[PDB]
Amino acid sequence: EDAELLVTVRGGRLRGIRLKTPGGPVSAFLGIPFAEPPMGPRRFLPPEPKQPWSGVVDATTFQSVCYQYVDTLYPGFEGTEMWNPNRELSEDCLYLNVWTPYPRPTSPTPVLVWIYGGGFYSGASSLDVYDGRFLVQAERTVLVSMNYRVGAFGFLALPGSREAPGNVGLLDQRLALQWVQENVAAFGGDPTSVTLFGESAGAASVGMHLLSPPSRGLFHRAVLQSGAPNGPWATVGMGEARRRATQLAHLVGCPPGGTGGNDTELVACLRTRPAQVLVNHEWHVLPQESVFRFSFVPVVDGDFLSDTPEALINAGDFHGLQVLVGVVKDEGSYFLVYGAPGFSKDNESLISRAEFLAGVRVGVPQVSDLAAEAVVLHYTDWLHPEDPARLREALSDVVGDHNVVCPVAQLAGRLAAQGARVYAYVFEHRASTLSWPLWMGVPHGYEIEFIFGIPLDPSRNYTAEEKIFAQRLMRYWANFARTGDPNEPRDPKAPQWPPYTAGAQQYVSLDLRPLEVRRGLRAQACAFWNRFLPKLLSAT
Amino acid sequence: EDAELLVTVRGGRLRGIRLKTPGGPVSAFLGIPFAEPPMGPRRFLPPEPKQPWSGVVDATTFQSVCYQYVDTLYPGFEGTEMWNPNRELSEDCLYLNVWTPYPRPTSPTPVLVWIYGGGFYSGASSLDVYDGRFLVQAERTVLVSMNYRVGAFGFLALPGSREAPGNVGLLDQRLALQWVQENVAAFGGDPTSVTLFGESAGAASVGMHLLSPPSRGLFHRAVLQSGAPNGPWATVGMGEARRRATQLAHLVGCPPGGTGGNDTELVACLRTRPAQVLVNHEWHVLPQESVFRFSFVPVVDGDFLSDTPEALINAGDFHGLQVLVGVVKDEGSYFLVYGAPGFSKDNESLISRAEFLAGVRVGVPQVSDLAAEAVVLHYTDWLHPEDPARLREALSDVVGDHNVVCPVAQLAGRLAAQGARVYAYVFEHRASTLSWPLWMGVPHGYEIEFIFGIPLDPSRNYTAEEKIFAQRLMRYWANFARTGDPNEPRDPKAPQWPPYTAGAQQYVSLDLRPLEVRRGLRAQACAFWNRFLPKLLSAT
Ligand SMILES: NC(=O)c1cc[n+](CCCn2ccnc2/C=N/O)cc1
Numbered sequence A, B: 001e002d003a004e005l006l007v008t009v010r011g012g013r014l015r016g017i018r019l020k021t022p023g024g025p026v027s028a029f030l031g032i033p034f035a036e037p038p039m040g041p042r043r044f045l046p047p048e049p050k051q052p053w054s055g056v057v058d059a060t061t062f063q064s065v066c067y068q069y070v071d072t073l074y075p076g077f078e079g080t081e082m083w084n085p086n087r088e089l090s091e092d093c094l095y096l097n098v099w100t101p102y103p104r105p106t107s108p109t110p111v112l113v114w115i116y117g118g119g120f121y122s123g124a125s126s127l128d129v130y131d132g133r134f135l136v137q138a139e140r141t142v143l144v145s146m147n148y149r150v151g152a153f154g155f156l157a158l159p160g161s162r163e164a165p166g167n168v169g170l171l172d173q174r175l176a177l178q179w180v181q182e183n184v185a186a187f188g189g190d191p192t193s194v195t196l197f198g199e200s201a202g203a204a205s206v207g208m209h210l211l212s213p214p215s216r217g218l219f220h221r222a223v224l225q226s227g228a229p230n231g232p233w234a235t236v237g238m239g240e241a242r243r244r245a246t247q248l249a250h251l252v253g254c255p256p257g258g259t260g261g262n263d264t265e266l267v268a269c270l271r272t273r274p275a276q277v278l279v280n281h282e283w284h285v286l287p288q289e290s291v292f293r294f295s296f297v298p299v300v301d302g303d304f305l306s307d308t309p310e311a312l313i314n315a316g317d318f319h320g321l322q323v324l325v326g327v328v329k330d331e332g333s334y335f336l337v338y339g340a341p342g343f344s345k346d347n348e349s350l351i352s353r354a355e356f357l358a359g360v361r362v363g364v365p366q367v368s369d370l371a372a373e374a375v376v377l378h379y380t381d382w383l384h385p386e387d388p389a390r391l392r393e394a395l396s397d398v399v400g401d402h403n404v405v406c407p408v409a410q411l412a413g414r415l416a417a418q419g420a421r422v423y424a425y426v427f428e429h430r431a432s433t434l435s436w437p438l439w440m441g442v443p444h445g446y447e448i449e450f451i452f453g454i455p456l457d458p459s460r461n462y463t464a465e466e467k468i469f470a471q472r473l474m475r476y477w478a479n480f481a482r483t484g485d486p487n488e489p490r491d492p493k494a495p496q497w498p499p500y501t502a503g504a505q506q507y508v509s510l511d512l513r514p515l516e517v518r519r520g521l522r523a524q525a526c527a528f529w530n531r532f533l534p535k536l537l538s539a540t
């Protein structure tokens, strides 16, 4: 019996579990409810806080995954199954988890809140690659992670209506942040040192919380990994949201008979349908064939988001905030096997000039033919315009720059130029255990396992250099959480990680090699995406 | 009166003069009349062949220079005075010069025919840098240079009218080519191996003879140096030519102020004006402030040019033709000190970005504001968007690529892919005697003195390494004229100069170092000018 594993919070008591790490034990509290189950009449509505409970809630295992699509493109393949749900699917899924060092810290400890990615259509906090036991044990911080609603259940929006207002998945995250405010002190946490961090759609969410006033007062630092709220895939307008919501209703038989019709009676019909029925038609509402586009994402409503994320980044003040931001080397490769012609996981994907011209249409959807011509102009190597290997890397960079790198570099510059101290990285190491083919390089999402210290797990087959690389990255992230500065405070013998400024544009390469300061985050390419291509679309 | 200084040609007899070179003598015949003086009622009309004469025409000195504007921007400055007339100005100027070795060759010798440059408004065959005594002595060739009418005298055009049909300066060059066919044998030359070569507007002229059927039967090889007929400055439309011709007439009081009627009374008025009065208003007819644009240039009339040079090149058969093309390292620098803001010959020309954006509108005249945005995007270094030394170098590349390098590269690819054997170079040696500032690099026009062996003149302070470099280039040019292949005819010992193909795009660097093969004649930059920019402007 340990008094460490019995905690009282505002709602009741919890029984935790003690986990082993190669270098010490850690207390965990997996499956804590922070909201009433959004089932039946609550589907599509904002979350209500959990009513207090009598007795002791068992918090020894992860709760259910939120209802989501399950990838089946490559069954039995490690590269895809590692992101698929490892628990049962249920709309009863609003639960968070807390990791804490053993023994519990006696002084207030910085808290790290993780928001998982998954294109706003998938993801769970229970994935093996988000295990916070290694980061908590080694750097003696407090880690909190949550489940938020994804897909139609979290982002179906009929704007104006109040039966399905939209962005309820973002409200699921905000409620979990208020929970950390009201309750993290019971676990040894400091409600005055909260660092949000996420990846992909999690990094976009972290960014959208920077831009929503009610959420701004709930955290103090931010880490955005391979994502940004200004990405072309992260938001939609009220009109397109209404269209996608309406066609999803039609595909599942709503409304029955004539279309009418009240938004009230359309949502009423959607609430009667089984959850799996809505999931099976989620991809049929995309307007065109495209990679890196998702059906139900945050909407610009006027409530949670006052304006477009690009507008609020420009007309904002970010003094006193510190932000860590970065991308991986090959951001766009992972998405090319999901629709781009000529691409396969199981061959070299040496595409022809014709397939490259068609892939540009899938990688940059809804563009004038002239805008398509300009992309082909900037990314072709006109000395070898038909080298398939070079065409392969080009389309990967087209998707990577358009969706991740350049929206990130856009946001990074505007933050430093408006108060915030910003540090930037580029993750360049390819894990030895990576199951994707060699030509994909360092794909989207494969820095997470090093940040969470997964290579320290003895059951894994990582190399000794990567274990050292893991603790080094865990040091950086934890230092940023405590001090707002990833540099080791009491250490002038280590390479300095200089801030990212709008003029010098300095970043570092995270690798098995020591730090290496570079300049320009795809500077020449992103000037096309951020400066010229907007004007080329204002032609017509 | 040596036995070889007296020659009988179809029109009569000539007395030549014997010139000295540091390694032997050379016979010269300077000032041979090949056309009737285009004066009085003959102004603006095509040339008439020279009537036969009695007695002996003295051909011991250069004749008069055609009436042309004289550069007064930098008085007394060697860099500009070397292109200014060195004989009296007169409309009586249709004369050619023939250099031939001593003793006269016993077998038919290949003929090089030189067409000078000067933007179709200036130039003369009597300039010191066009002295063919060093070329014909070292490589035993027959060199022929003529004068052609420049400016309004050679290129004023009222299309449709027979009083000023236009392109008469090109007809002057052709009539001189017909003269070479009927008379070069009397000097030891072979009228079945005539190699045209010119620079700047002379290279554009050489190119336009390739596209005019009546002229293509008068030569067999071509060398285009820093020029091409498809350059944006080398032609104008019939509508623009009429507008410039009538505005020049207005500025000199034509028509007889004021009864604007038929083109007959307009040209009749222009014929009564002194030659100097027309020249004094040449630059006032340009539509706008521009660099590398000239008032009276050849016109697409449907006669000499049945279609635009771009059209005739794409739809042409060039089998059995050898073509040598090339450019200098810094093509655009020379033209910046004439119209570009912030530029001066006597300072470092470290322009600001505000001046860089204004020079783009002067270097690329008459493009939409969106088209200017694209140029700025491509030539800006977005890591140093305000570095003055980089903006200076970038504006030099804009003017150079837009007007010379890319119009050349387009022509070179179409010639090779359509039958012609093409060799290409890039001249990269800055002469030690060059008087222009250091930041101009190797400017437009400063390879000519090495091709003509001018460093071999002992009175000039060239270095020993430059004399050898001159003989190297004189060999390449003579080997091309003799064989059609610049490589030493049976020499595997020397490095090899490979041809230029549309796929490989191989060229050589002419420098004090031995030959170095390279791929890509500004391949990425020219893809913007040749491929994308036309589509950007055809979408107004
Ligand atoms: N009298 C004037 O205002 C005047 C204007 C332009 N110019 C053009 C200079 C001649 N030039 C030489 C090389 N390139 C050029 C013209 N570029 O536009 C000369 C004189």
Ligand SMILES: NC(=O)c1cc[n+](CCCn2ccnc2/C=N\O)cc1
Residues within 6 Å of the ligand: A071, A283, A290, A291, A292, A293, A334, A335, A338
């Ligand atoms: N059944 C189908 O036709 C289908 C279409 C799209 N998907 C989306 C695959 C998930 N995905 C992962 C990374 N990126 C994407 C989607 N677009 O890029 C799945 C199934």
Ligand SMILES: [Cl-]
Residues within 6 Å of the ligand: A083, A117, A118, A119, A200, A444, A445
């Ligand atoms: Cl992912």
Ligand SMILES: [Cl-]
Residues within 6 Å of the ligand: B083, B117, B118, B119, B200, B444, B445
């Ligand atoms: Cl010149």
